[PDB]
Amino acid sequence: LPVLLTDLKIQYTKIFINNEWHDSVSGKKFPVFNPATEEELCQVEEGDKEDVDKAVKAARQAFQIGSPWRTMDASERGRLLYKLADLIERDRLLLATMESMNGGKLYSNAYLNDLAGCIKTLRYCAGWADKIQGRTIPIDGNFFTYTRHEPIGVCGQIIPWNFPLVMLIWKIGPALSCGNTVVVKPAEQTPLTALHVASLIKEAGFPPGVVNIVPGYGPTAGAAISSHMDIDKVAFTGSTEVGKLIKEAAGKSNLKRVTLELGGKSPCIVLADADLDNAVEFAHHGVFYHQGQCCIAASRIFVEESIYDEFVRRSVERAKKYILGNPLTPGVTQGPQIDKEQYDKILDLIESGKKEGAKLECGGGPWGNKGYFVQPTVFSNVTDEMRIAKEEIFGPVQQIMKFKSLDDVIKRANNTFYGLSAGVFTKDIDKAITISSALQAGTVWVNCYGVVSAQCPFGGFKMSGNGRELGEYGFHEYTEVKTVTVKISQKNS
Amino acid sequence: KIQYTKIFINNEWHDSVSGKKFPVFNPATEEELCQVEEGDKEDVDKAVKAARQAFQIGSPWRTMDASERGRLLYKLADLIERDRLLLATMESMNGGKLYSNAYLNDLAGCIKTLRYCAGWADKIQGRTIPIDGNFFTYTRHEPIGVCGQIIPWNFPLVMLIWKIGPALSCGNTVVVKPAEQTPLTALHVASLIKEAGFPPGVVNIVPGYGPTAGAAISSHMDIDKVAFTGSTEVGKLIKEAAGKSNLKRVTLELGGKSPCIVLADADLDNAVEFAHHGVFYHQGQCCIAASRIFVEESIYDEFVRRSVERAKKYILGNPLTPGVTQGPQIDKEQYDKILDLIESGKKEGAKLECGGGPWGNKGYFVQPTVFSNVTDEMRIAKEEIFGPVQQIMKFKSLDDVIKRANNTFYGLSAGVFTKDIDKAITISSALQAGTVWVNCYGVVSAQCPFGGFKMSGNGRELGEYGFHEYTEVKTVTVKISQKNS
Amino acid sequence: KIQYTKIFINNEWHDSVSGKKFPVFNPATEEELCQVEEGDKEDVDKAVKAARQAFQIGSPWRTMDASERGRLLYKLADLIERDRLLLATMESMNGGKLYSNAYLNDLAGCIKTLRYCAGWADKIQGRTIPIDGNFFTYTRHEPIGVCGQIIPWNFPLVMLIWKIGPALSCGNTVVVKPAEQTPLTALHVASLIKEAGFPPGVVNIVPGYGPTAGAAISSHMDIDKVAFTGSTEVGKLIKEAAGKSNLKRVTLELGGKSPCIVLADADLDNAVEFAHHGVFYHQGQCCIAASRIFVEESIYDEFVRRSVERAKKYILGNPLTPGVTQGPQIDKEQYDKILDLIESGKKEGAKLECGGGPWGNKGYFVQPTVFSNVTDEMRIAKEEIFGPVQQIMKFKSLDDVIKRANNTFYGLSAGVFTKDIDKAITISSALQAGTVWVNCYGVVSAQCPFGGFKMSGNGRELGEYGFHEYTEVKTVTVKISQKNS
Amino acid sequence: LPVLLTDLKIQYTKIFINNEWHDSVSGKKFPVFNPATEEELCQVEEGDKEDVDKAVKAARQAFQIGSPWRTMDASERGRLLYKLADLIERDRLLLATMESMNGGKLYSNAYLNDLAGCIKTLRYCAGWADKIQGRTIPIDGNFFTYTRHEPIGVCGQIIPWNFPLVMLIWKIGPALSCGNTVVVKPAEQTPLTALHVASLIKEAGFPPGVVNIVPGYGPTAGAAISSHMDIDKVAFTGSTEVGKLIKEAAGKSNLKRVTLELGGKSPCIVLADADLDNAVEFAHHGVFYHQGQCCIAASRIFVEESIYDEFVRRSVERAKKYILGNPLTPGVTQGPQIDKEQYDKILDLIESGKKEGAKLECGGGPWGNKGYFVQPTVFSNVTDEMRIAKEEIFGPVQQIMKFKSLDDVIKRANNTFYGLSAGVFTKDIDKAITISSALQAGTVWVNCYGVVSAQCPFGGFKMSGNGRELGEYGFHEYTEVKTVTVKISQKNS
């Protein structure tokens, strides 16, 4: 049961460099608002290329051969990450309340889900710390060859605003586990929890400069990170347009490694032989979790004809019960979106869906005078041609298309440039495996949705990202392989 | 013809130390083909001496390239494919295996296993450990040494390959002791091993009798590993001998009574066909025989009716004849034991449905016998038969039938038939079996590992699991000046 | 004080079925601390019943999350760190281990092993196989079941952790049988296990005597695995019992006579210090003792001269005293055997250099004895001593000394000292030892696996190698409609 | 012993699409010359964006779910690759003669080193075919999660000219092993062996469209491949500038995966306690193998103060004996370079080194009236500031710098933006491991050089490439991970 708490005091608003808090060299500060009330919470230091460089220099110094972080035992890095997780669990109340106040997130999920996944992921990576290993290779000839999975180096990391803490942890878990030093750039919407976790990183005992944080804007600080020459990798999570921009900036400068996590118009096929109650509930959760501001949101609910009507009749009823109010309230089940821009975008896309001809089965429009709230919306009889059926809405808008044959739905779901996720709802053994094989998605769920843990990898296929995270897969993308071959007197099998 | 009936050591053929020769009989007509030298303690000792000379540091084999070992294995597989017809006919005659089963399933499987183990030769790898302190630690996979391999008669060639291919791919020297019933295929494969280009002494064969030759291999001090694939009593006797001498590594693959759990949602045609095959494949002398074919009540009477019908179409005849789908058994002892088990099942009240007795005084052929209404205290459902005998038991609840299938000391394999994702996953995890099939049975391939959960097995095969069994892990730690991530 | 001296079953303390209690003696003064219940066949049976109830499908432990299992193990490690002082003092008193060795090396190593095995809980994974045909095949790592663990006295806590941490991380229920000499630490750790929050029946302890309790564990039908870490005779007696009952899995870690090969190019100071430590660490009762410390001729007389000098500075006294670098032995039998071995070495002509006899009638203390000019037929170089006895042998050629070091039935570990890359790699790859150190000795860590190459062990530990030992592999093949790459 | 060669007949000069030979839709044909004699060998069809597109269409069709290549067993793909290797071993004579005639490569190394490496790599990948495996993940909650390492899709591949056959095999080994369909674009200098191997691919029995080959130019066909939207990955090997261009073209469109293998300026540190004969011989081989046209060429030979003068004295002697004639002639040890462009570039860089002040101790000028021949050149007293000490020469020009302390040499070797390789020559156990750890290179050799086998991975750290090849590592690059999660009734440990 979450303790309500209902209070905060944001004493951390600076740039975290060299285990120290510095104002931006420019001196500017930008405001961070509260989505529920639109009131400024505080003024966070505004970093830019100069501050990004001042942070990358410290990171590079921390990564020098002979520095504590390099001569640190892998088990010691794991122990430091575990102590950070313990410190976060100690401050789970404050961090959850900050996430709900500043990210507009429901406090119940901010405490029970997001903070929980944060500690779980931090502990998973702390465990992996001293278990990533190389291989001794059976090379031909009298040679002894092995591989070192060394840290890549300086890894700039660009966090989104939808899951500030969870994504911060997803980034600085594998990176610090594998021995790298990072310069994180958090979203301007949600820069506060990252700074508190930065203070916690200092407290846990990480060497100075191992983790630095630069709050700012994407064009100024994110672009500086992605174009920096002294940065060895960039790991960006966000929109596909900024993903292409990050890839470009990396390719132009110092040919760094790039790891993009982009959006997706994920489908949710619901076959005739599906558990209608479970299918309906999980479709609702998939498309409406976190005000639809989830990269894996089920934005294309395919339903077979034989069960279409029922499904709609049961989806609307599920979307009509969705309480919507102040996040710090137990009865509230939907909160404000993030800020004005996404709120307006969701409203505009709702209007576009209405115009195109998609049956508005649930109320599409604002709720309340104060805050960026949108009514849970449902569209029926949607077709693949409509904008709402092709563009990532990132809002609480549910599309419901109808199909007849299975191969038709396979083609329709694979007929897109997004490949982040997909869902299949059936009781059969053949349909499940067939559709899971045929669906071009980096994570196919069967009879569930939104099921992510630190263990299994997460990523996209076509344009929904590059590489994977969350596991051995996620860790091998934060290491550079070095083959060391030694000429030896004689080799025996 | 059989031009190889001797002891294969140092790439050369030798007669037994005693000079004794035992006969090999074709069960289809019991006309002995040739006399094969009887391996005894002295023959085992000299074969092991040859192998240990071949494994010595600096020898051609130890200094050979793992890629070159795989290339040698691929050469051996291609030569075996060249003479596929001869080996197929010789296996079918010696063991009675149906010619279609001996050619399209046995030799193809041997080739696939050899070409898989050949592929794994230079890809098996050790690991570099991030140890604590200023040390550089790494581990390496080394061949263990001499591998005494005991290959009973149900699958002579396939088991010989399952035994050597992993061993010759991991870089071990094999002293294979075949079955007295079917020793000829191993000898011909040894001749093909010589043709392929293996260094002398890498592969040695010592045909004989298990009580004398196999026991000698299992007790030998210089045999690093013993790998037996056969009866559980013999596996118990090999394990106790292995511990007493050398604390040698032991890998025992024993047969088992394996359930096939059929549910109402299962496709009845596929379920019937696969339950038929999983028990009558290779005339029942299969370590994976589906001996406890459970069925749901709702289709119980509908299953047997169809199942029995299939048993009535199972043509019984000489293996080389076309249109025949079954052959004779391996010898007279198995014939007598099969008839004894059938009589015991009749006595204990197992309702016979079809067949149920011997046939064809010419040979060791047995009619496909289908029982019914079998229970869990009968000795035809708990005693391993190794014969074409089906036991169509019954159940009503899923947890109780799971406890039934797991109510046994035998866990080599299990089967499940269900059109429901939830049921399939629940049953496969629940059953205590090394291989749990779903909607199919006996789908064995070189990639998927093979072992047994209970007394039925020890260790794994056929994959990256079957290649860490033939190797030792040697850890090397070096004190370095200063370690960096 | 010792508030835990009973049998730990179902998270509760029980007295023995017979009611008998055996004594535990501190070797430093031989004043018995407390009486510990004697585990017998009935106590082993009830502990195994508790464990098998804890391992049942649907139980809290089986349905627990692997990540949650790791979290439980981390809680256990943190609690053990909370009471580090109590456990360190209790280990030092009960076993005589030096307090510095008991605190800064024993408890720290226990914590590191627990926090490594905790990390491996949810990262061990099975694999999806590209099988042939229209089938989907995958494999999974299932805990094997009940793990009867026999933990002799040289490293009670470190070995108990090396035994359970892997088991509780792979999801197995442990019935640990400690050493009669040092059973108290296991009981206190079981109390801390209760405090941590393990489900009842996951961990059970049955202190007693090996001939009665350990044999009962090794012969029990429901014990899936037996893991013994001690003398080779007992290892052989456990292996033969293991095969006879249940065909249970056997993991034996036995001590060995391990060489330390010192060459002229080696740094003489480091070589002397590490040869000293590798044999006199923990007063010689170390399974890895560097018992065959070879030396090159060019520095031979220069090595002993310095080596002996170090032995003369080795302070001998009560473990809890500061400035002491050695403690007493484990009991009177080891004392008598150490003196017998010293007398035999003197009789056979091993040139004594320093010490060479008992000391301190108060306790079981022994002077550090350094022999010299030892050879390969003497019984102080081929018989495992488990005492502070060094055997400074000699060699001239590299191949012959390699054959010497490999001239033995014991291969647990080996050592090499050389400032030459080529020599280091050549010797490391040449030796038939499962852990070859270079320029160092006894650098053991939870990451690097540990095992024996010969009769000095079987299986591996401490790493992914030591976590596939506590698990089975279950293949699961599903017939699918159409497979695509 | 190379089997003596016979006169050639180049009967394969077209575009290989759908297991068929088609002229370029434009109809143009470009000439391929013989570097030793500058005579045109034949006119190879000139592909462009249109031919690349009509090849990618066939590749995509071959990759469709339900096509033979998709329903092919992994063991069957390995069997087909093994049959291709058998065919190449059968035609080893012709292929080696073609490689030597068209690539200017010595026939002895073309037959013993290059063709042997090709068959070994093809057989290694054919072995891996059905052994690349996913993982069943221990996900939290009652879920059954596993992973499929599916083929990425269409993989455009751009081969260089220095190792035509070896690089063609390095590309189409892991790709076809993991189940992908490829559109290879070979260098215009060396397009002939690729086309013969294409005919061999057809003969072995690969399904139509699985492998297609488009001979053309980098700006026209290579850029088309790297900018195609229907292509899922691009794997380019060549210069760093074109690597940046490939990364850009991938980032601008399709957000495809990119694998670059670029050049390097690799150091070869020779310490005082080194086996001077072996060190000198291997330095010569490293810098002069394949007329210096090796990506891993030892272009910076660091020598310690104590053994410098002697090292120069014997390096000059070793380089003075390097017989230099027509490749097909036995006893020749150096041949023509590739074509006029690289010949002129090497001459210009030699002149720049002369002007800067590096002492020319051997060679340093053209050779022969016919053919692109350069005398083995040796520079001494080089400094890190000179152009020859910073720019990849790619010719038979040897640089020899002097150092005193090991720290100095570590920094100097790590003072470049290239990270492809490095070499260390010492007898000690501490120096070897220390320098191998400290040197920022994707392949450190100790007391040897140029030691590459199919097993161990190959790649570069900073700007010498992205990712790795040649082993399980190469395979991870060529597969997309798909996590399939199924909600189950109950899960047990």
Topology:
The structure is a homotetramer.
Chain A: E1 15-17, E2 20-22, E3 29-33, E4 40-45, H1 49-62, H2 68-71, H3 74-90, H4 92-103, H5 107-128, E5 136-137, E6 143-151, E7 154-158, H6 164-177, E8 181-185, H7 192-204, E9 211-213, H8 218-227, E10 233-237, H9 240-252, E11 257-261, E12 266-270, H10 276-288, E13 298-304, H11 308-320, H12 340-356, E14 359-360, E15 377-382, E16 397-403, H13 406-414, E17 422-425, H14 430-438, E18 443-446, H15 472-476, E19 479-487
Parallel strand pairs in A: 7-8, 7-10, 8-9, 10-11, 12-13, 12-17, 13-16, 15-16, 17-18
Antiparallel strand pairs in A: 1-2, 3-4, 5-6, 6-19, 14-15
PDB class: hydrolase
Keywords: aldehyde dehydrogenase, aldh1A1, hydrolase
Assembly: tetrameric
CATH class of the largest domain in chain A, named: Alpha Beta
- Percent of residues of chain A in helical segments? 25-40%
Structural class of chain A, by secondary structure, is: alpha/beta
Give the strand order, joined by hyphens, for the main sheet of chain A: 14-15-16-13-12-17-18
Biggest interface goes to: A-D, 62 and 63 residues
Shape of chain A: globular
**Oligomeric state of the chains present here:** homotetramer
CATH topology of the largest domain in chain A: Aldehyde Dehydrogenase, Chain A, domain 1
The CATH homologous superfamily of the largest domain in chain A is termed Aldehyde Dehydrogenase, Chain A, domain 1
User: How many runs of DSSP E, i.e. beta strands of chain A?
Assistant: 19
Rg of chain A over CA atoms, rounded to whole Å, is 23 Å
Count, helices of chain A: 15
* Residue fraction in strands of chain A: 15-25%
CATH architecture assignment name of the largest domain in chain A: 3-Layer(aba) Sandwich
Q: What characterizes the major β-sheet of chain A? A: 7 strands, mixed
- Intertermini distance of chain A: 60 Å
Q: How many domains comprise the coordinates of chain A?
A: 2
Binding site for NAD(+) (chains B, C): 151-154, 177-180, 210-211, 230-231, 253-255, 333-337, 384-386
EC number (chains B, C): 1.2.1.19, 1.2.1.28, 1.2.1.3, 1.2.1.36
Pathway (chains B, C): Cofactor metabolism; retinol metabolism
Keywords (chains B, C): Acetylation, Cell projection, Cytoplasm, Lipid metabolism, NAD, Nucleotide-binding, Oxidoreductase, Phosphoprotein
